Amino acid sequence: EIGTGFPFDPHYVEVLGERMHYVDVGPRDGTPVLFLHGNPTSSYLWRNIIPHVAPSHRCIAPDLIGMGKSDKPDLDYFFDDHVRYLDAFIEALGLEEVVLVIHDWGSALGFHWAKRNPERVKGIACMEFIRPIPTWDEWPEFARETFQAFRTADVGRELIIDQNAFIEGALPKYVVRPLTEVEMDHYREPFLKPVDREPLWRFPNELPIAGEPANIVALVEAYMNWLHQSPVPKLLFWGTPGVLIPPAEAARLAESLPNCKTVDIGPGLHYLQEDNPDLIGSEIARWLPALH
């Protein structure tokens, strides 16, 4: 069975007046591997991947502001909020060079950080990452009505805030295998209080779909252009049918992105880490020393 435990000691750092939680395991020095979750997850998402990497490399996995075990400031939780807190987290830990391992909004954060700090990114492993979705036509049908409703005034907050639809609905609907109740309870814990679900609602409203919001579309286009022109080593995991990165997109990217390896994980929708963590972890571990 895929592991349900979270056997990592909590670490905390004060960031912009707020405490942020992170995992910090493996060697205490050397290039760290920075794992960035997205919506509506936490460092828990990486629990079965980190043990493959920690034998060789320091592993750092923060909980984004307002998520996981991190503090809950009264923010609007726009992408720019997350940018500010993650930038300040990285500086608070004194990180210099990093390897990024990124997913969903963690990928938007990671790629955006890399474009702005290109000399400090030694490699990027990514999966089910955020790219511009030019039309609803390209958003897979099985999840389209949901995300459209998430992005609709009043309806979206009833679903995500009042009814916890991101946790109880979208999350398990984006894993091919069934999540267990222990796993669901780990994902539920930060969000037992409805008001605390603001990040979960703002995130889908930030997705670059059909040209809006235009500032996020621009930001994401900018880092995708950066990624097409960067020689940084890249490792792209993909599943079938996928969500953000369908198989045909993964194959196009394998050709268009420089120095890119693609790994097929088999069945997968969005949270690929919950369907095939062993292959993702073992392949990252095999790939890291090649960043040499």
Active site residue 128: yes
DSSP, collapsed to helix, strand or coil, labels residue 61 as strand
Mark the segment that binds Cl ion (CB under 5 A) among 5-13, 71-79, 100-108, 188-196. Answer: 5-13
In this chain, which of 27, 241, 258, 267 binds Cl ion, going by CB under 5 A?
267
Q: Determine if 153 is a binding residue for Cl ion (CB under 5 A).
A: yes
Q: Determine if 230 is a binding residue for Cl ion (CB under 5 A).
A: no
Among Cl ion, Mg ion, none, the one that 289 touches (CB under a kind-dependent 5 to 8 A) is none
Identity (one letter) of the amino acid at 268?
A: G
Measured at the CA of 139, the angle between CA 232 and CA 76, to 5 degrees, comes to 75
Report, in Å, the least distance between residue 34 CB and Cl ion.
Answer: 21
Report, in Å, the least distance between residue 183 CB and Cl ion.
Answer: 10
Q: What character string, x for contact with Mg ion (CB under 5 A) and - otherwise, covers 3-22?
A: --------------x-----
Q: Determine if 2 is a binding residue for Cl ion (CB under 5 A).
A: yes
Q: Determine if 202 is a binding residue for Mg ion (CB under 5 A).
A: no
Both tokens of 204, joined, read: 């889908």
Enter the DSSP assignment of 211: T
Q: What character string, x for contact with Mg ion (CB under 5 A) and - otherwise, covers 135-174?
A: ----------------x-----------------------
**Selected catalytic residue, list 24, 63, 81, 128:** 128
Q: Determine if 148 is a binding residue for Cl ion (CB under 5 A).
A: no
Residues 155-194 contacting Cl ion, CB under 5 A = 157
Nearest residue to 146 (alpha-carbon basis) of 216, 209, 102: 209
Among Cl ion, Mg ion, none, the one that 17 touches (CB under a kind-dependent 5 to 8 A) is Mg ion
Tell me which residue has tokens 């592993």. 59
> First-to-last CA distance in the chain?
34
Q: How many CA atoms within 13 Å lie on the side-chain side of 54?
A: 14
**Selected catalytic residue, list 112, 270, 274, 275:** 270
Active site residue 228: no
Active site residue 270: yes
Measured at the CA of 175, the angle between CA 188 and CA 217, to 5 degrees, comes to 85
Instruction: List phi, psi (to 5°) of 43.
Output: -55, -20
Determine contact, residues 126/63, Cβ cutoff 8 Å: no
Cα–Cα dist 2/287, whole Å: 22
Sign of the dihedral through C-alpha 5, 8, 14, 16: negative
Q: Which residues bind Cl ion (CB under 5 A)?
A: 2-3, 5-6, 48, 153, 157, 240, 266-267, 277
Catalytic residues: 104, 128, 270
